[PDB]
Design a protein around this nucleic acid. Sequence first.
DNA 1: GTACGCGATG
DNA 2: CATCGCGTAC
Lengths: 214, 208
Amino acid sequence: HHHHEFDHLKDLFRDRLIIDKVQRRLPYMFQLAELESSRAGKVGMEVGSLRERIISSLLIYKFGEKNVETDLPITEPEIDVKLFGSPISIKTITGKEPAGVKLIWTVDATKARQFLETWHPRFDLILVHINWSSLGGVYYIPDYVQQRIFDEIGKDKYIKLPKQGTNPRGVEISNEALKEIMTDEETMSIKIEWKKTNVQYNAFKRWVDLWSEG
Amino acid sequence: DHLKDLFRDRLIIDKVQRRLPYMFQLAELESSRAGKVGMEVGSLRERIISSLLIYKFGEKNVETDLPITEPEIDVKLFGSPISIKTITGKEPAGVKLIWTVDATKARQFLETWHPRFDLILVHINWSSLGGVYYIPDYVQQRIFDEIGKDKYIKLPKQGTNPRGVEISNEALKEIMTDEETMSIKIEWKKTNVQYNAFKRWVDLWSEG
DNA sequence: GTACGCGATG
DNA sequence: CATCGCGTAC
Ligand SMILES: [Cl-]
Ligand SMILES: [Cl-]
Ligand code: NA
Ligand code: NA
């Protein structure tokens, strides 16, 4: 179709046109996502679900709709999209460096410990490190990189349980494990300067107009 | 806060009955994956209800500038906080008062919380009958006073993977069916509407 | 009944 | 160190 771009993830990350489009436009697209996922200028966690659409759409752009399977139930653990049948986890995180990234959105103490004792990395990860007005990047972290680090340090150092007596939102990858998987030689990245654009937008207008018309 | 006006104005009621299902269907279409609806649909439904308030009562009288992580309060109407909640089913069940699963913090909530704010509860029942309910703070408080915190508030069940502290189904039934609660009946009829979530973004990648 | 998605911000 | 939003479906 007319919106097609003229180890598949390796190919994506080395494609010069993809690199240029991501560097030039990912900030703008992510800014539209946040403008649609906020209230009083504060961004909701649900922005992640919209950013995920944007990243899956990059895959469709390069590889074609026939080769990207987006039809995964929204509550599926980990896997967000498949590329030529191969599962991909997408994660997004804002900060000077990524911190506190979740592996599962479970807070119950018993279920969290069950996860710690059973989970290991299985899926290729696309991690977007957002750092507004500064430098971040998008990272392709192969399943085997995650497995290497997990094998080396063990579950008890890789996985951080929710802290009891606080109000958290899930089981996290440890900050040390995250930094190690992001910086492995076999991890690929596109660096991004997250420059903001003067784009505005009132979330309520569409709906007020639908109430008012006719 | 004049919310009773919305529930007594025949003309606005008619627009709500004719248009709420369509708008809520769009919200679901934009909050799904593989045709399964995400919890975040509630945040978009809330925007639709706040917009109804803006239309009925005026921009000047509806404050929407509340942080997205504010507990309970979603909007203010003539200065008065309003909680908006949405729920799908044959009857409303398992509705959250706070999105805390931690056992200790959930207990603390149980021990300290009481109803304070007017509630707009939207009961969605696709292809059947539901409604929009205005449940005044005083109705919630009266039921809470009669049955007590331990019958009104349901703690997250330990050893399961839930999402928060709930109003009990007993309490929800009582506040919904109270004589002083007002409602607009809604026939939740689906409309033929085509939409693809990814198209916008694929097209922007191509244009970019 | 019980499974589960999405991180930003004090 | 910590705080909090949003229910569906299975
Ligand atoms: Cl991960
Ligand atoms: Cl309530
Ligand atoms: Na994800
Ligand atoms: Na709400």
